[PDB]
Structure 1
Amino acid sequence: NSGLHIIIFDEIDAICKQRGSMAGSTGVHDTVVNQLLSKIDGVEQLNNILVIGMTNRPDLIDEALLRPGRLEVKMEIGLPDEKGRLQILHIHTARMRGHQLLSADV
């Protein structure tokens, strides 16, 4: 019986990368990944965390960090279709429409 703890990573491809690909950093970009892996799921077990990651280059992230049990739900966010564009354009003009600042011919 414990609360929920959330952690958000932004631009996760800056610190986590395929192990051994980099060379010349003096070894600082090779222990960070090991610590992260050992901490998310190690000999000790946690059950009250939720980690969210965002990235623009999904192909460079470590493979051992994407197996089920560490980062399961992989989603793709893409361009909308006509209905989506209509929904966005309705969402972004409600305030103007409410106060009668939008003309009648739009």
Structure 2
Amino acid sequence: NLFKDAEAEYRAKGEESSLHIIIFDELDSVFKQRGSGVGDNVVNQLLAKMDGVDQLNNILVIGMTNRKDLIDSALLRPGRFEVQVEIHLPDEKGRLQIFDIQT
């Protein structure tokens, strides 16, 4: 149900649609490596929707997590979750700038 509205717009307008966003938090709680269960159903249902038989290019999905080496190995292939970045703790200049913005 999270992709319905954006999809409707893509069908209506075309390539002139308005961007949609989907924020996922704690990606390491359900999406664990499928081995050889309810988890597999979840992983497959997401896989078939992120990039499936029907093209859909008016979306952008961000994901946030605390353990990056536990997501299944097929969810990190060029095309689905492409760019991976790291957030460090603030340094001294970061603290000064944070103080500047907050105060």
Q: Which residue of 1 aligns with 2:45?
A: 35
2:95 is the alignment partner of 1:80? no
1:1-80 → structure 2 map (5 Å cutoff): 1-20=16-35, 27-80=37-90
Q: Give 5+ residue unaligned stretches, structure 2.
A: 1-15
Q: Deviations over 1:32-88 (max 9, x none)?
A: 001101110011110011111110011111111111110111110001222111101
- Give the aligned residue type for 2:55: Q
The runs of 4+ residues in structure 1 deviating greater than 4 Å are none
Q: CA RMSD in A?
A: 1.3
Identical positions, percent? 77
Instruction: Give me the TM-score of the superposition, normalised by structure 2.
Output: 0.79
Distance 1:40 1:16 in 2: 14
- The size of the alignment, in residue pairs, is 88
TM-score when normalising by structure 1 = 0.77
Q: Which runs of 5+ in 1 are unaligned?
A: 22-26, 94-106
